[PDB]
Design a protein around this ligand. Structure first.
Ligand SMILES: CC(C)CCC[C@@H](C)[C@H]1CC[C@H]2[C@@H]3CC=C4C[C@@H](OC(=O)CCC(=O)O)CC[C@]4(C)[C@H]3CC[C@]12C
Ligand SMILES: CC(C)CCC[C@@H](C)[C@H]1CC[C@H]2[C@@H]3CC=C4C[C@@H](OC(=O)CCC(=O)O)CC[C@]4(C)[C@H]3CC[C@]12C
Ligand SMILES: CC(C)[C@@H](C)/C=C\[C@@H](C)[C@H]1CC[C@H]2C3=CC=C4C[C@@H](O)CC[C@]4(C)[C@H]3CC[C@]12C
Ligand SMILES: *[C@@H]1O[C@H](CO)[C@@H](O[C@@H]2O[C@H](CO)[C@@H](O)[C@H](O)[C@H]2NC(C)=O)[C@H](O)[C@H]1NC(C)=O
Ligand SMILES: *[C@@H]1O[C@H](CO)[C@@H](O[C@@H]2O[C@H](CO)[C@@H](O)[C@H](O)[C@H]2NC(C)=O)[C@H](O)[C@H]1NC(C)=O
Ligand SMILES: *[C@@H]1O[C@H](CO)[C@@H](O[C@@H]2O[C@H](CO)[C@@H](O)[C@H](O)[C@H]2NC(C)=O)[C@H](O)[C@H]1NC(C)=O
Length: 1098
């Protein structure tokens, strides 16, 4: 054996550790003693048994042994690094070839004048150094909760710097006693010095595995790439698909140019015959008994008026309106609320210094004297302060105030060192535990982590609620904050849960809605004037009281069945009926009016029966089409959409009944007591010669609208939902601006044994032997791609760490018994529950049987003050147990800011995706907002089926009545053009797709068929007098049933809507005006210009 060093030669400094004694290479080391060999192998390993002629003695191994142990806690987390760390120094002093890779440089004289090496040069393989640095790269310290490389390598970033800290001459701070040159440049041809090269280990090594938290290699690297979208190029994939179709499709058509079956099976034929006879009897009975039918209608609007007012009439809460109770997300919310309690009521308050940082001597002193008012002496009318309602982690501990005031224990820190004191707490919240023993992250409290330069702070107050007493407290808080007089240069934007249920029901848009409908009545009376010029006000006024009587009858009839009328019903239902119910007034009146001429059945009562007989079949067929469209939506899942599907289907059926029996009686009565003597629709419509041009223009419009379809965005911005100029406008605009923390995410695990070792390894995140794709590792690796980018609050890891023997303060039991040893008995009789040699980082002595609970109860009740690892404060309400098994548990994770509607839907997908990413765990992710955004997942395919199925109904409900497949297909061809055209202006007009929009898009089909169905039927059931040809019939219908549309639904809904543009609410202006102003212009264009041109070319 050859050694360049051996033995010990005094010390280089008084009152200091001794220094090795350099020796030349000529000498040979003596045989090691028995004691030295046993100690050397124990500290280093079993591989040293073969070698028994090392270059170290008893005095050297003991010194080396002591120095290795002191560094053991730092690197004990990752055994791979620990082995490498000890291997380097073990071969430094005991390698038989010590001088081969260690070259002495200078020698000095010690206190005894012996030989002591001042410095030496050590050479090693570059790859070996990289592996060593890689092994200890990401080791995480326990107490510091941060990278352990800082303490061992001084924050080194490369192996060259890290190794230098090891070899640097630092006699102070327990460092090395001499300088060591870890050079990386040597040649093997010297024949005297060879770079050190021995076994090395890495994190990925199967033998010396390391926890994923301690090394990236161990973490699950599979992580299959997430992809659930179809986009190609700068446009959506469907847009490219449609555009590509036009190019290729046009090629086939261009080359070609350059180069009713219903007679059979007359069962349907007889339908058009008996139906007219049936309505003739209804018309006959409604004209011969006008009083018997009018009294009942007046009686019905009295009995139903009784019900809608007194017997029962109720609205619904925001949760009921939006989310269906059967949705899987809501079923999960009930489980979370039932077990882990409802989520806290959050009352955010923002203090903003627009042009600088809020933190100052004036504001810090001022806010402390206003945050001590809200949380101390703000008794509401019921005389309940915040303390009564505030949320306490446990009864002993005070409640939580997520504000920077909680730093300094809520007391003034004096105007001498506030800047310095606040900075320290933010960096390490553990050492500044608030009065509730819960760490406060700086991201939540402050907008900017700089703290001193932060431009605002968050004063979120969390209430556990006390059964409607909390609801009353926010009233005082809401009033109090508004009345606050903040100093110059500051502003307050706040929020309170009462705001959503209070601010929402505060709009005064009824003024504009009432006026708009008032104008509709005024025009309707003047639009019923006779051909000569007489004005039938009594008929129009009475006719408008029948359409408004159907709403009351339906709105009161359903309240008899327990249905609740949503606030949406107050707008959509009146609009639909005033359109369906106004067309029938003009069609029946004009048909009678045209029956005044031609003197068919001169008798006044006969002129009406003929009028009903001619026009009722189209009215009934349109009614079935509109009933079928809404009835389909009744199969939807959302309750607000489902609610409308039931109201409209009834508000329209009742309208049909009152527009064929009650109104006919009014018409019969009015005309009889009036006895009026019989004294551009053709000039312009003669332009029908431009048939091909109209089809081309309207066909190009449809095709161009088909490529903008996939550009529609989902979601409903809440900022517009509430009335404008509110106190929320400066909050919602500020929650997306100065808030850097997203909603909490609760990874609820259910029915997992969590006692047998096998199950514990699926949640471990800090131990080695646990499964690679555990709950923590998977969620740790998903912090970089998913929207869930905040550390997991793993209680299982904390519980096991609490048992660590090194944490003597945390766990302590009385000797000879399992009784706990609280701080009230500081006598040193108590010892740690787990022995030093039992607990290991590789889950060796961890509880497996009933002992898991024997220590979980001790942990969960730990004070948490003596040491940061405790259970009472952080994880007392996180897990549900019954002394035998953990029924369920929760791992709070939290989202990222989520400051847009697209992000909100994106966040929900991550919860559903991650929830399903674990097939071995009965797990689900709960966040407060998940229930609201459940619909948007299937809102894409859903609206295809609801609208796609409605079109088929139009083609099938109107096929029997028309008995002409060609005319029925065209009717369904123009009804689909309207929605597709309206479906592309939604993207262009900035109207999103949601429940509020989905219902509106359904009544576009219900109202789109209203315009076109009448014209198509008159084109197919023309009287024998007119010629039987495409052009003549089309011209006849527009003269006959075209004026009833231009002066009826078209203008009636266009005169009132135009004035409706002056609505103040942003939600009403977006989803209810920009969509009912587009279906009255798109449908009017498509029914009065496209349809006459299309039918002529049927
Ligand atoms: C004439 C107009 C004013 C009638 C509108 C009917 C309202 C009763 C509906 C329409 C859209 C609904 C909103 C659509 C979206 C949401 C989801 C959600 O919005 C939020 O701001 C909370 C989001 C979260 O919890 O993170 C809570 C209910 C709310 C505001 C809804 C409350 C009830 C609203 C305002
Ligand atoms: C069941 C099938 C075989 C019937 C074929 C008849 C078609 C003419 C129907 C079937 C589905 C319908 C579509 C279903 C849904 C929509 C979206 C909707 O427009 C939008 O604003 C987009 C909404 C969205 O889907 O996100 C209304 C028109 C459109 C394209 C419909 C147009 C007419 C379509 C293509
Ligand atoms: C202040 C300490 C706690 C910091 C630096 C962390 C770990 C210490 C204990 C480590 C870091 C580098 C290590 C180190 C470098 C050099 C020497 C000199 C050698 O002849 C004996 C081993 C010894 C002494 C070892 C073991 C102990 C040291 C000094
Ligand atoms: C807000 O921060 C600013 C620093 O950017 C504080 O200082 C004054 O800010 C106003 C603008 O609001 C300027 O007009 C003054 O010139 C600034 N003075 C100084 C000395 O910087 C400001 O006081 C802060 N607002 C508070 C504490 O209410
Ligand atoms: C504590 O709760 C657990 C979980 O609910 C109970 O264990 C379950 O008991 C049901 C029957 O009630 C079994 O079907 C399950 O297989 C058990 N295990 C799990 C993981 O659910 C346990 O019985 C409860 N302890 C007491 C004393 O009631
Ligand atoms: C966890 O690490 C401990 C500490 O090394 C291991 O304990 C030793 O395991 C070997 C396995 O054969 C036994 O021969 C020893 O008697 C055990 N004790 C000691 C002090 O060495 C334990 O095996 C490891 N377990 C796992 C699963 O890795």
């Amino acid at each position: 054996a050859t050694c360049a060093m051996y033995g010990n030669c005094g010390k280089k400094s008084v009152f200091g550790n001794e220094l090795p004694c350099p020796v030349p290479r000529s000498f040979e080391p003596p045989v090691l003693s028995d004691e030295t060999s046993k100690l050397l192998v124990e500290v280093c390993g079993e591989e040293w048994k073969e070698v028994r002629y090392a270059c170290c003695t008893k005095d050297q191994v003991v010194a080396l042994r002591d120095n290795l142990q002191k560094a053991q806690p730092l690197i004990s987390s990752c055994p791979a690094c620990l082995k490498n760390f000890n291997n380097l120094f073990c071969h430094f002093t005991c390698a038989a070839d010590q001088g081969r890779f260690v070259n002495i440089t200078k020698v000095e004289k010690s206190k005894e004048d012996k030989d002591i090496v001042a410095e030496l040069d050590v050479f090693m393989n570059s790859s070996w150094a990289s592996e060593f640095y890689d092994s200890c790269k990401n080791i995480k310290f326990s107490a510091t909760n941060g990278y352990a490389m800082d303490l061992i390598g001084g924050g080194a970033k490369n192996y060259s710097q890290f190794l230098k800290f090891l070899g640097d001459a630092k006699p102070m701070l327990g460092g090395s006693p001499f300088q060591i040159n870890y050079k990386y440049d040597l040649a093997n041809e010297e024949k005297e010095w060879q770079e050190f090269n021995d076994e090395v280990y890495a994190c990925d090594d199967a033998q010396y595995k390391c926890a994923c938290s301690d090394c990236q290699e161990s973490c699950p690297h599979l992580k299959p790439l997430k992809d659930g979208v179809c986009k190609v190029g700068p446009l959506p994939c469907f847009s490219l698909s449609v555009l590509i179709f036009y190019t290729i499709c046009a090629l086939f058509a261009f080359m070609w140019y350059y180069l009713v079956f219903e007679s059979f099976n007359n069962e349907t034929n007889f339908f058009n015959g008996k139906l007219a006879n049936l309505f003739t009897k209804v018309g006959q009975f409604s004209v011969e008994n006008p009083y018997k039918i009018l009294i009942t209608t007046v009686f019905s609007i009295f009995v139903f008026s009784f019900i809608i007012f007194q017997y029962a009439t109720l609205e619904t809460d925001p949760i009921n309106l939006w989310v269906s109770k059967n949705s899987e997300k809501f079923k999960e919310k009930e489980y979370f609320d039932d077990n882990f309690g409802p989520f806290y009521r959050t009352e955010q308050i923002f203090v903003v210094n627009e042009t600088g940082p809020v933190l100052s001597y004036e504001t810090l002193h001022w806010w402390f004297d206003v945050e001590n008012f809200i949380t101390e002496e703000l008794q509401s009318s019921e005389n309940i302060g915040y303390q009564d309602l505030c949320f306490r982690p446990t009864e002993d501990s005070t409640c939580v105030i997520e504000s920077f005031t909680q730093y300094f224990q809520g007391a003034l820190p004096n105007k001498d060192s506030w800047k310095r004191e606040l900075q320290e707490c933010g960096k390490f919240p553990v050492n500044c535990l608030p009065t509730f023993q819960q760490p406060l992250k700086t991201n939540l409290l402050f907008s900017d982590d700089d703290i001193l330069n932060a431009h605002a702070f968050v004063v979120t107050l969390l209430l556990t609620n006390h059964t409607q007493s909390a609801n009353r407290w926010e009233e005082r808080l809401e009033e109090y904050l508004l009345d606050l007089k903040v100093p110059e240069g500051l502003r307050i934007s706040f929020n309170t849960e009462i705001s959503l249920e209070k601010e929402l029901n505060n709009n005064n848009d009824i003024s504009t809605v009432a006026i708009s409908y008032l104008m509709m009545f005024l025009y309707a009376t003047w639009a019923l004037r006779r051909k000569d010029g007489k004005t039938r006000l009594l008929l129009g006024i009475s006719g408008l009281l029948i359409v408004l009587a159907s709403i009351v009858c339906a709105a009161g009839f359903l309240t008899l069945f327990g249905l609740k009328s949503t606030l949406i019903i107050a707008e959509v239902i009146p609009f639909l009926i005033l359109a369906i119910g106004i067309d029938n007034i003009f069609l029946i009146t004009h048909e009678y009016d045209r029956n005044c001429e031609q003197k068919p059945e001169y008798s006044i009562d006969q002129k009406i029966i003929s009028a009903i007989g001619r026009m009722s079949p189209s009215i009934l067929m349109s009614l079935l089409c509109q009933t079928g469209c809404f009835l389909i939506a009744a199969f939807v899942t959302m309750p607000a959409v489902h609610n409308f599907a039931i109201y409209s289907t009834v508000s329209v059926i009742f309208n049909g009944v009152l527009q064929l029996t009650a109104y006919v009686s009014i018409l019969s009565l009015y005309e009889k007591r009036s006895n009026y003597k019989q004294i551009l629709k053709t000039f312009y419509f003669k332009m029908l010669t431009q048939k091909r041009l109209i089809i081309i223009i309207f066909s190009a419009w449809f095709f161009t609208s088909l490529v903008f379809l996939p550009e529609i965005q989902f979601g409903l911005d809440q900022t517009l939902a509430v009335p404008q100029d509110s106190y929320l406008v400066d909050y919602f605009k500020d929650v997306y601006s100065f808030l850097n923390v997203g909603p909490p995410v609760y990874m609820v695990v259910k029915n997992l044994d969590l006692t047998k070792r096998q199950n514990q390894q699926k949640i471990c995140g800090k131990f080695t032997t646990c499964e690679r794709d555990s709950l923590a590792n998977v969620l740790e690796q998903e912090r970089h791609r998913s929207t869930i980018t905040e550390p997991l609050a793993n209680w299982l890891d904390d519980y096991f760490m609490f048992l660590n023997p090194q944490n003597d303060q945390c766990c302590r039991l009385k000797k000879g018994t399992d009784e706990v040893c609280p701080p009230s008995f500081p006598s040193r009789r108590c010892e740690t529950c787990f022995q030093q040699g039992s607990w290991n980082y590789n889950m060796s002595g961890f509880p497996e049987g009933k002992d898991f609970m024997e220590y979980l109860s001790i942990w969960i009740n730990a004070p948490s003050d003596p040491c940061p690892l405790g259970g009472r404060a952080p994880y007392s309400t996180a897990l549900v147990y019954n002394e035998t098994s953990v029924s369920a548990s929760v791992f709070r994770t939290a989202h990222h800011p989520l400051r847009s509607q697209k992000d909100f839907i994106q966040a929900y997908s991550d919860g559903v995706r991650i929830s399903s990413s674990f097939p071995e765990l009965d797990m689900f992710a709960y966040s407060p907002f998940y229930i609201f955004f459940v619909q948007y997942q299937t809102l894409g395919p859903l609206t295809l089926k609801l609208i796609g199925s409605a079109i088929i109904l139009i083609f099938f409900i109107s096929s029997v009545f028309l008995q002409n497949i060609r005319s029925s297909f065209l009717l369904a061809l123009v009804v689909t053009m309207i929605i597709v055209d309206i479906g592309a202006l939604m993207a262009l007009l900035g109207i999103s797709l949601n429940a509020v929009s989905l219902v509106n898009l359904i009544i576009c089909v219900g109202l789109g068929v209203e315009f076109c169905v009448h014209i198509v039927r008159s084109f197919t059931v023309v009287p024998s007098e007119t010629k039987k040809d495409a052009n003549s019939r089309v011209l006849y219908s527009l003269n006959t049933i075209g004026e009833s549309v231009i002066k009826g639904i078209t203008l009636t809904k266009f005169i009132g809507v135009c004035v409706l543009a002056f609505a103040q609410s942003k939600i009403f202006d977006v989803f209810y005006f920009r969509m009912w102003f587009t279906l009255i212009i798109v449908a009017a264009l498509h029914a009065l210009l496209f349809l006459p041109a299309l039918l002529s070319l049927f």
